[PDB]
Write an enzyme that holds these catalytic residues in place. Structure first.
Site, PDB file in Angstrom:
ATOM      1  N   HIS A  77      68.785  11.259  31.623  1.00 39.57           N
ATOM      2  CA  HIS A  77      69.531  12.313  32.240  1.00 39.57           C
ATOM      3  C   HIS A  77      70.324  11.953  33.471  1.00 39.57           C
ATOM      4  CE1 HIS A  77      67.518  15.997  30.081  1.00 39.57           C
ATOM      5  NE2 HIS A  77      67.792  15.026  29.282  1.00 39.57           N
ATOM      6  N   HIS A 244      63.819   8.945  21.349  1.00 37.72           N
ATOM      7  CA  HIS A 244      62.829   9.821  20.673  1.00 37.72           C
ATOM      8  C   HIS A 244      61.799   9.028  19.912  1.00 37.72           C
ATOM      9  CE1 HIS A 244      65.575  13.587  21.285  1.00 37.72           C
ATOM     10  NE2 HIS A 244      65.192  13.010  22.429  1.00 37.72           N
TER      11      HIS A 244
HETATM   12  C1  HEM Z   1      71.367  14.685  20.990  1.00 34.58           C
HETATM   13  C2  HEM Z   1      70.908  14.178  22.131  1.00 34.58           C
HETATM   14  C3  HEM Z   1      69.560  14.607  22.644  1.00 34.58           C
HETATM   15  C4  HEM Z   1      68.970  15.776  22.597  1.00 34.58           C
HETATM   16  C5  HEM Z   1      69.439  17.186  22.119  1.00 34.58           C
HETATM   17  C6  HEM Z   1      67.705  15.588  23.266  1.00 34.58           C
HETATM   18  C7  HEM Z   1      66.777  16.607  23.440  1.00 34.58           C
HETATM   19  C8  HEM Z   1      65.610  16.492  24.084  1.00 34.58           C
HETATM   20  C9  HEM Z   1      64.656  17.536  24.378  1.00 34.58           C
HETATM   21  C10 HEM Z   1      64.844  19.010  24.089  1.00 34.58           C
HETATM   22  C11 HEM Z   1      63.589  16.968  24.951  1.00 34.58           C
HETATM   23  C12 HEM Z   1      62.379  17.705  25.449  1.00 34.58           C
HETATM   24  C13 HEM Z   1      62.349  18.117  26.920  1.00 34.58           C
HETATM   25  C14 HEM Z   1      60.942  18.695  27.224  1.00 34.58           C
HETATM   26  O1  HEM Z   1      60.705  19.781  26.665  1.00 34.58           O
HETATM   27  O2  HEM Z   1      60.171  17.979  27.917  1.00 34.58           O
HETATM   28  C15 HEM Z   1      63.832  15.536  24.966  1.00 34.58           C
HETATM   29  C16 HEM Z   1      62.835  14.648  25.346  1.00 34.58           C
HETATM   30  C17 HEM Z   1      63.039  13.287  25.507  1.00 34.58           C
HETATM   31  N1  HEM Z   1      64.225  12.657  25.244  1.00 34.58           N
HETATM   32 FE1  HEM Z   1      65.829  13.507  24.353  1.00 34.58          FE
HETATM   33  N2  HEM Z   1      67.474  14.301  23.575  1.00 34.58           N
HETATM   34  C18 HEM Z   1      68.659  13.673  23.319  1.00 34.58           C
HETATM   35  C19 HEM Z   1      68.943  12.355  23.535  1.00 34.58           C
HETATM   36  C20 HEM Z   1      68.091  11.484  24.277  1.00 34.58           C
HETATM   37  C21 HEM Z   1      68.416  10.159  24.539  1.00 34.58           C
HETATM   38  C22 HEM Z   1      69.750   9.474  24.405  1.00 34.58           C
HETATM   39  C23 HEM Z   1      67.321   9.621  25.200  1.00 34.58           C
HETATM   40  C24 HEM Z   1      67.111   8.357  25.744  1.00 34.58           C
HETATM   41  C25 HEM Z   1      67.562   7.156  25.361  1.00 34.58           C
HETATM   42  C26 HEM Z   1      66.300  10.607  25.108  1.00 34.58           C
HETATM   43  C27 HEM Z   1      64.980  10.376  25.509  1.00 34.58           C
HETATM   44  C28 HEM Z   1      63.981  11.387  25.550  1.00 34.58           C
HETATM   45  C29 HEM Z   1      62.549  11.094  25.829  1.00 34.58           C
HETATM   46  C30 HEM Z   1      61.995   9.777  26.174  1.00 34.58           C
HETATM   47  C31 HEM Z   1      62.002  12.373  25.798  1.00 34.58           C
HETATM   48  C32 HEM Z   1      60.558  12.681  26.067  1.00 34.58           C
HETATM   49  C33 HEM Z   1      60.177  13.188  27.378  1.00 34.58           C
HETATM   50  C34 HEM Z   1      58.737  13.250  27.742  1.00 34.58           C
HETATM   51  O3  HEM Z   1      57.942  12.524  27.046  1.00 34.58           O
HETATM   52  O4  HEM Z   1      58.365  13.906  28.723  1.00 34.58           O
HETATM   53  N3  HEM Z   1      66.757  11.707  24.523  1.00 34.58           N
HETATM   54  N4  HEM Z   1      64.936  15.214  24.400  1.00 34.58           N
HETATM   55  N1  LIG Z   2      66.402  14.205  26.508  1.00 33.27           N
HETATM   56  N2  LIG Z   2      67.103  15.445  26.715  1.00 33.27           N
HETATM   57  C1  LIG Z   2      66.392  16.568  27.191  1.00 33.27           C
HETATM   58  O1  LIG Z   2      65.293  16.409  27.657  1.00 33.27           O
HETATM   59  C2  LIG Z   2      66.873  17.986  27.099  1.00 33.27           C
HETATM   60  C3  LIG Z   2      68.059  18.423  26.348  1.00 33.27           C
HETATM   61  C4  LIG Z   2      68.282  19.823  26.290  1.00 33.27           C
HETATM   62  N3  LIG Z   2      67.431  20.803  26.923  1.00 33.27           N
HETATM   63  C5  LIG Z   2      66.286  20.247  27.664  1.00 33.27           C
HETATM   64  C6  LIG Z   2      65.991  18.871  27.759  1.00 33.27           C
END
Ligand code: HEM
Ligand SMILES: NNC(=O)c1ccncc1
Ligand code: HEM
Ligand SMILES: NNC(=O)c1ccncc1
Ligand SMILES: NNC(=O)c1ccncc1
Ligand SMILES: [Cl-]
Ligand SMILES: [Cl-]
Ligand code: NA
Ligand code: NA
EC number: 1.11.1.21
Lengths: 713, 713
Positions: A77, A244
């Site tokens: 982020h 993810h």
């Molecule tokens: C289409 C693009 C993406 C969408 C819509 C998205 C969406 C989200 C959402 C909704 C969460 C959950 C937030 C929560 O409730 O804690 C999340 C978690 C996470 N995202 Fe994404 N994400 C995207 C791309 C990315 C990318 C590019 C990365 C990193 C390279 C990433 C890494 C993470 C990780 C590591 C988590 C887990 C967080 C935790 O374990 O606390 N995401 N993502």
């Molecule tokens: N990795 N991206 C996020 O955590 C995210 C995207 C949209 N709403 C909340 C969190």
């Protein structure tokens, strides 16, 4: 307390040019972050960060006993706000810790993440910035969970107040499209310069477009927004699936249990927010996005399980405990671990936007190749992660520390090393004389150097005259650059160059990049002589010439000036008024209001306008460096009115006779209208100000010529 | 574009501390306005201004062929925004030329007046500021029309952006009282710090209170507002009658003919506004206030015809051509000249507020004296006009040029001249050791010097330690100053002073003002030594001691700190939160956010709190200069909650045990909540920061000690 913005909410805002003063910076004026960083024991920092990964704090307990997923998301982020349109956003200023980004809904509970890092920040102090620390932590999270990163560079200096960035015009967080301030028009066309689908999101909505759970349509939003962040399909699939592979989402109860974001919270919250009344409000009970998804069977370890799951099951639409749309694997067993209870397991789950990686036909091909060739996936994700987190750092000369990758990447707009002696002062004088003897005019010399140097933007440190890319596609064909005129100047300068370089001994040569800049300097010198003034313009050699193959033409497109008030240029008709676009351009150039003012008034008289337009050319001695622009603009003997044909062009007539004396644009006349700009104009249009005008113009010209010169830092 | 102020409209605003940066200033860092002004040919400026008075421009023709009335109004309005409550407003920074004041309805058509002065401003350039020129022009107007002024001082340096001033919370110009943002409550009590009855007015409404044409009731508003601008009844009558000896009002047609104020106008209007569609829009057809009154038979010459008319006729309520309430002389002949038609004459006319001077019983006494004794009137007006126009200039040491009045006025808070040799560095070291050996504590020494120096406010340059007024009424009895404690310290220091001065030869002596400051310096040095650090705090002698007889006790009342966050002091309960009052105090002190932050955290640990409160004293080594405030505030091991008894006091408990560790107020805990302030606190709370904290604290201490030292400029 009613303010000027309340009374006159459409007046132009100059305070964006005077942010980041020495007043708001706690560091001394001589502090140099690069020098501090270079003495940091980076290895020591990394050991502390490794230790932190599993040191759970009770006020925000670590999922699975390991904070690595949280930290990866934090770093993603930090970097994820970047927009290629203007270079604004990104990780490079540590802005996640200021408003508004510290309180965007998509950054919920990253306040917890940053607070867990305070002890390390405190321990190392000024030798590691927040901005560097956020990215380093993400790298260490990956390394700790078994992923080998491509490298890391330090050098992101911290900033001390919020950046003035246009994030959109909506007045409601997360508003869906088609409202009174919609960022979308036509066939889902996102307004430039935005790179997110809703106010407060990073790229897209995880439930699907405007909350509709259609993976195919979500894919379209993913592709458009990631492209607006400089990422292509391969990089996008790599980043999403890579990210993810780790961690989980948080949606254990209804969102209505979640309180005020940090900037709204009470003073006792001490800078944190999103306090939740749901059960214990944390840990197993956490609520962040409202979704409840855990992607892999080992969320704290690098695996190939993301694409095994994505392709190995069929998916059913379901709702989380907060009511959000998400997907669950049909007929699957409970194989996914729980974050806190070793007696619970869960079925595989996915977001809408994860499913995009399979159901969009272009992404599917990439996803399948990554599923079949996991080494390709790992490599692509490492490269993409590096690019993501370094995209706004600027030239490789700014990259600090022991982990900087040696490989030169095309996206870095690389500049070859200089491997030969540079021209000295005697050589510079000889080349300036040759340029003036060639017949190139002041207008041609100034215009060309301006064109070359003014592509720089300080938001991501791209552009500038280093590289001589003005001679390459696509810069050589941009309308603002006057392609036919440009070609004629470059041919003459290349002939001077070749003749000079062919006469040398001992390996000395001059680059075309340096000669363009030097030739511009000679134009300004010649203009000063035309006005009767003996002036020397500073020049620093050492630019090199990049090749076409080192110049990604599609990435260069976003540096095209479609509005450049300094050359009275507007490529089309826009909704934002041209004087706001001038101030925006000045901000990218790093100029203060006084610098913007002197620069523009001098360029107008030197003949820097596109097409030799007379708009704003308020002098009878064009190509002489005088303060005429200001003296004439401020003459109350002239009355101004918009023309019948075009409300954005104005005619200045003698008040007593009606006779036409000048024409100007909004960019020209704002200097006579805006009460702060007019005060600056008055200084330069005073009878005591000619010498001040000249010496300030030379200073700001030189500043512009050196904006990308991090080889001299 | 949605901004942070939009999302979080109640968050504190730190940008008020970071105005006036070197970024926004077009002058070089070494420019010194006093040095420029001192070489101005002031006589030559005045000759040009005399000539201008009768040189009409067709775009705003001169009434009666003479601009003098217009210019007097312009100068009066420049000075007339001043409020004693905070010292804000006034003529001293030339703010009439920026928003909002340039577009206030009471300033209508002064845009014309300022434009008439551009040729002079342009001729003399940086040697005469706009701020000085506005006042000088009013004095030349008066002198040109036969009035002998009391004198004039230059030295008001120009500013380059608008000041952040609270002018009220109304969202409509001129709103009548009793709206949702009314500035009145109770029995017509005007809210502090305001000094005007309606938003966009200077003092009062010329038709009467909220437009009711009752001279008696108007008098109440006149008296209250003028008192809030430091003027008593004699001065008030002198000013109003003096001013309204000259010129006329403008109300020739309906107000709906008048267009946008300057900040709202089109770009083509080039900084002018109020363009009128009534007839020619100017001159005989002008509309400014909507009233149409000409007071005297010779509007371009000094006379005593205002009072001859006020007392020689009875008055009838009438309406102007724009519909405004005004008065006309019953039975009178047409004896007042017309401004443009030498064949027309008019009956005498008056405003409601003019009639106040006869129908209020206290005003009537003064007015009658001035009518019978016009020499008394002339003298009072001259003195009042000098005071009005100089009230915010600061100490007489700032007054520049050949026309400074030699008479020292009580309102100047005068400081006697020093006529003896000053202590040298060795003497200062001897005195610091004597102070430390007396048994005065770090807390006593720091608190006393703080109390003395922190009455300074840069708004009108009043206050500060020069004068040793802390030993006099009323400062010695202010609650914030801890009167019994203060008396004890002052006795001890006066004995030190007596003993040192009695041992000298050659006339060398030290003032008590200097020794209070030097003693504070010794306290800060001792605190640093308590922490294990040898530092020298800078000291500059040369302050003198004023007498009680040279001290206006009633004028000094407005400098009482009723809120001083630096001593965790709030005299009562206010509607504005204490953190906002802190930032207001810091702006008055001329501090940036970094300076405010270091200063407060150091004061907390030195024992500067009023009453020895423990709130914010986050240290176990009180009276040692350390960064403990920051390190303890930022410790995530502590949890904070508001107390039951008082929501504005917070308890800090150990998060694991519940044990009470600290208490704090909103002023203390804002440094851990506000995202920009917390970022500053982190720098000083870092493990590398001890040296920096001490250095920066010493620097801001010395800054505060020296705020009123214009004798050293
Ligand atoms: C289409 C693009 C993406 C969408 C819509 C998205 C969406 C989200 C959402 C909704 C969460 C959950 C937030 C929560 O409730 O804690 C999340 C978690 C996470 N995202 Fe994404 N994400 C995207 C791309 C990315 C990318 C590019 C990365 C990193 C390279 C990433 C890494 C993470 C990780 C590591 C988590 C887990 C967080 C935790 O374990 O606390 N995401 N993502
Ligand atoms: N990795 N991206 C996020 O955590 C995210 C995207 C949209 N709403 C909340 C969190
Ligand atoms: C109760 C306080 C005051 C009230 C309500 C007031 C009201 C007004 C109004 C309504 C006008 C006409 C504006 C226009 O239509 O052009 C004006 C004009 C003027 N006032 Fe005042 N005034 C006050 C105090 C003062 C003071 C203290 C001075 C200076 C010492 C001053 C000097 C003038 C002069 C010189 C003009 C004439 C301007 C011209 O000839 O263009 N006034 N006054
Ligand atoms: N908003 N951020 C930028 O525009 C930027 C930051 C640093 N220098 C130039 C521009
Ligand atoms: N001298 N004061 C004025 O000119 C004024 C007072 C109130 N409304 C408009 C103008
Ligand atoms: Cl930014
Ligand atoms: Cl002010
Ligand atoms: Na950026
Ligand atoms: Na003031």
């Amino acid at each position: 307390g009613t303010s000027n913005r309340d009374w006159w909410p459409n007046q132009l805002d100059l305070s964006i040019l005077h942010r980041h003063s020495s007043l708001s910076d706690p560091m001394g004026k001589d502090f140099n972050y690069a020098q501090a960083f270079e003495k940091l024991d980076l290895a020591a920092v990394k050991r502390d960060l490794h230790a932190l990964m599993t040191t759970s704090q009770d006020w925000w307990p670590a999922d699975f006993g390991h904070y690595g997923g949280l930290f990866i998301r934090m770093a993603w982020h930090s970097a994820g706000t970047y927009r290629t349109a203007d270079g604004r956003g990104g990780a490079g200023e540590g802005q996640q810790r200021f408003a508004p980004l510290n309180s965007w809904p998509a950054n919920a509970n990253l306040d917890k993440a940053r607070r867990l890092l305070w002890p390390i920040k405190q321990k190392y102090g000024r030798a590691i910035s927040w901005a560097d620390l956020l990215i380093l932590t993400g790298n260490v999270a990956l390394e700790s969970m078994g992923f080998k990163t491509f490298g890391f560079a330090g050098g992101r200096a911290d900033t001390w107040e919020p950046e003035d960035v246009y994030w959109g015009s909506e007045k409601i967080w997360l508003e869906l499209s088609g409202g009174p301030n919609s960022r979308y028009s036509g066939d889902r066309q996102l307004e430039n310069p935005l790179a997110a689908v809703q106010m407060g999101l990073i790229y897209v909505n995880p439930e699907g477009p405007d909350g509709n759970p259609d993976p195919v349509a979500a894919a379209r939003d993913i592709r458009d927004t990631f492209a607006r962040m400089a990422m292509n399909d391969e990089e996008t699939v790599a980043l999403i699936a890579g990210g993810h592979t780790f961690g989980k989402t948080h949606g254990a109860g209804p969102a209505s249990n979640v309180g005020a974001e940090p900037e709204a919270a009470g003073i006792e919250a001490q800078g944190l927010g999103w306090k939740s009344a749901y059960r214990t409000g944390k840990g197993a009970d956490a609520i962040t996005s409202g979704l409840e998804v855990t992607w892999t069977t080992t969320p704290t370890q690098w695996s190939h399980n993301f694409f095994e799951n994505l392709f190995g099951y069929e998916w059913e639409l379901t709702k989380s405990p907060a009511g959000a749309h998400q997907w669950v694997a049909k007929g699957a067993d409970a194989v996914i671990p729980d974050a806190f209870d070793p007696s619970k397991k869960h079925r595989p789950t996915m977001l809408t936007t994860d499913l995009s990686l399979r159901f969009d036909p272009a992404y599917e091909k990439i996803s399948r190749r990554f599923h079949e060739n996991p080494e390709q996936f790992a490599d692509a994700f490492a490269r993409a992660w590096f690019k993501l987190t370094h995209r706004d750092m600027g030239p490789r000369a700014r990259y600090l520390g022991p982990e900087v990758p040696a490989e030169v990447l095309l996206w870095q707009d690389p500049i070859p090393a200089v491997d030969h002696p540079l021209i000295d002062a005697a050589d510079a004088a000889e080349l300036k004389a040759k340029v003036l003897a060639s017949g190139l005019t002041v207008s041609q010399l100034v215009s060309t150097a301006w064109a070359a140097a003014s592509t720089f933007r300080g938001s991501d440190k791209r552009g500038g005259a280093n590289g001589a890319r003005i001679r390459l596609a696509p810069q050589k064909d941009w309308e603002a650059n006057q392609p036919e005129q440009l070609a004629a100047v470059l041919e003459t300068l290349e002939a001077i160059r070749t003749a000079f370089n062919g006469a040398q001994r001992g390996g000395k040569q001059v680059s075309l990049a340096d000669l363009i800049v030097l030739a511009g300097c000679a134009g300004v010198e010649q203009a000063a002589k035309n006005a009767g003034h003996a002036v020397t313009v500073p020049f620093a050699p050492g630019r090199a010439d990049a090749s076409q193959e080192q110049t990604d033409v599609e990435s260069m497109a976003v540096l095209e000036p479609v509005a450049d008030g300094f050359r009275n240029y507007l490529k089309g008709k826009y909704r934002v008024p041209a004087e706001v676009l001038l101030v925006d351009k000045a901000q990218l150039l790093t100029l203060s209001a006084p610098e913007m003012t002197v620069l523009l008034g001098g360029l107008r008289v030197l003949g820097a306008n596109v097409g030799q337009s007379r708009h704003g050319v308020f002098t009878a001695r064009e190509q002489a460096l005088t303060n005429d622009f200001f003296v004439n603009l401020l003459d109350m003997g002239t009355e101004w009115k918009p023309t019948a044909a075009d409300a954005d062009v104005f005619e200045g007539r003698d008040r007593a006779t009606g006779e036409l004396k000048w024409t100007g644009t909004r960019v020209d006349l704002v200097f006579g209208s805006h009460s702060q700009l007019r005060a600056l104009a008055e200084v330069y249009g005073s009878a005591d100000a000619q010498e001040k005008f000249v010496r300030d113009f030379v200073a700001v010209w030189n500043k512009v010529m050196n904006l990308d010169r991090f080889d001299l830092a």
